[PDB]
Scaffold this motif. Structure first.
Motif, PDB file in Angstrom:
ATOM      1  N   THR A  34       0.818  -1.217   0.000  1.00 50.35           N
ATOM      2  CA  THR A  34       0.000   0.000   0.000  1.00 50.35           C
ATOM      3  C   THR A  34       0.857   1.276   0.000  1.00 50.35           C
ATOM      4  OG1 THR A  34      -1.953  -1.032   1.000  1.00 50.35           O
ATOM      5  CG2 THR A  34      -1.691   1.325   1.374  1.00 50.35           C
ATOM      6  N   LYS A  36       3.288   3.951  -1.385  1.00 54.00           N
ATOM      7  CA  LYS A  36       3.381   4.362  -2.776  1.00 54.00           C
ATOM      8  C   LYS A  36       4.722   4.996  -3.087  1.00 54.00           C
ATOM      9  CE  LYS A  36       1.295   7.205  -6.324  1.00 54.00           C
ATOM     10  NZ  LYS A  36       0.819   6.178  -7.281  1.00 54.00           N
ATOM     11  N   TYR A 190       6.891   8.760   6.576  1.00 53.44           N
ATOM     12  CA  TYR A 190       5.546   9.185   6.942  1.00 53.44           C
ATOM     13  C   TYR A 190       5.655  10.133   8.134  1.00 53.44           C
ATOM     14  CZ  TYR A 190       5.564   6.353  11.144  1.00 53.44           C
ATOM     15  OH  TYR A 190       5.840   5.855  12.394  1.00 53.44           O
ATOM     16  N   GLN A 251      -0.480   8.522   4.562  1.00 55.81           N
ATOM     17  CA  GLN A 251       0.063   7.656   3.530  1.00 55.81           C
ATOM     18  C   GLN A 251       1.555   7.479   3.748  1.00 55.81           C
ATOM     19  OE1 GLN A 251      -1.186   9.789   0.006  1.00 55.81           O
ATOM     20  NE2 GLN A 251      -2.859   8.329  -0.341  1.00 55.81           N
ATOM     21  N   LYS A 253       5.050   6.780   2.112  1.00 54.68           N
ATOM     22  CA  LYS A 253       5.661   6.941   0.804  1.00 54.68           C
ATOM     23  C   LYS A 253       6.961   6.161   0.740  1.00 54.68           C
ATOM     24  CE  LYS A 253       2.508   9.764  -0.747  1.00 54.68           C
ATOM     25  NZ  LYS A 253       1.576   9.349  -1.832  1.00 54.68           N
TER      26      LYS A 253
END
Ligand SMILES: CCCCNCc1ccc(S(N)(=O)=O)cc1
Ligand code: NA
Ligand SMILES: [Zn+2]
Length: 257
Positions: A34, A36, A190, A251, A253
């Motif tokens: 998940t 990215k 994050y 999110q 990364k």
């Protein structure tokens, strides 16, 4: 009086530190599928050539190797960061067993330990000011797995006998933290928090993909440390990790594909 026991551990912290249930708490599980890839992420710049270590301290929760942060001597730049972050200390979290000890997890996998190299944003002048800012700290997290010895860790292991109990410190000059890094600087990042009280939401987390290997003997010596002070009942310093917290509106990364 917070700690890692049944009666003062992570499940209790929220009563004194309500931010424990906040919106950007650490650590988290890193779900690799998940996360990215962010092509705009710059390479990490780790500049530790002029690092000046000073002391190692058992603070009753872990041990800290402290650095001179009164000048730009050991700094972290680049990656997700804007500006210059000075290395102030590193420490570890570890388990009682080889299959637990890390704070971050990767697809729910726990490592034997986790190294935190703590840096603060120099635009805030000192560490105490930095922890009050949402971009005040950058912590570089590195997983430890048990296998081959890490030669660069042995000087740390060697001195632990002299700081067995809470409040003990020892000289620890001329240590090179570059010897604690893996080959690759590929990372996840994050926005998060300190993983211990006061759990301030001031940290940009940068967690390296590649673990380092340490030997069973090296981590065994971590586990001989004490939470307690000298002359107090012995409590082995083990399982000083906070479990993964809800990701909420964040999110993760990745710097790599
Ligand atoms: C207001 C003073 C806070 C002191 N707290 C230090 C500290 C540094 C790093 C981490 S970690 N484990 O997130 O890297 C926890 C706690
Ligand atoms: Na071994
Ligand atoms: Zn830590």
């Amino acid at each position: 009086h917070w700690g890692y026991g049944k009666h003062n551990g992570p499940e209790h912290w929220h009563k004194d530190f309500p931010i424990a249930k906040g919106e950007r708490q650490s650590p988290v599980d890193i779900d690799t599928h998940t996360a990215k890839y962010d092509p705009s992420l710059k390479p990490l710049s780790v500049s530790y050539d002029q690092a000046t270590s000073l002391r190692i301290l058992n603070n009753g929760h872990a041990f800290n190797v402290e650095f001179d942060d009164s000048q730009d001597k050991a700094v972290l730049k680049g990656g997700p960061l804007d500006g210059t972050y000075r290395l102030i200390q590193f420490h570890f979290h570890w388990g009682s067993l080889d299959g637990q000890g890390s704070e971050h997890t990767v697809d729910k996998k726990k490592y034997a330990a986790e190294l935190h190299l703590v840096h603060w944003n120099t635009k805030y002048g000192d560490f105490g000011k930095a922890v009050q800012q949402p971009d005040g700290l950058a912590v570089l997290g590195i997983f430890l797995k048990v296998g081959s010895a890490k030669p660069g860790l042995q000087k740390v292991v060697d001195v632990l006998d002299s700081i067995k109990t809470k409040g003990k410190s020892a000289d620890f000059t001329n240590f090179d933290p570059r010897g604690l890094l893996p080959e690759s600087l590929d990372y996840w990042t994050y926005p998060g928090s300190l993983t211990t009280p006061p759990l301030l939401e001031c940290v940009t987390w940068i967690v390296l993909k590649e673990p380092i290997s340490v030997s069973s003997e090296q981590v065994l010596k971590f586990r001989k440390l004490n939470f307690n002070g000298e002359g107090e009942p012995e409590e082995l310093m083990v399982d000083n990790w906070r479990p993964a917290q809800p990701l909420k509106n964040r999110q993760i990364k990745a710097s790599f594909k």
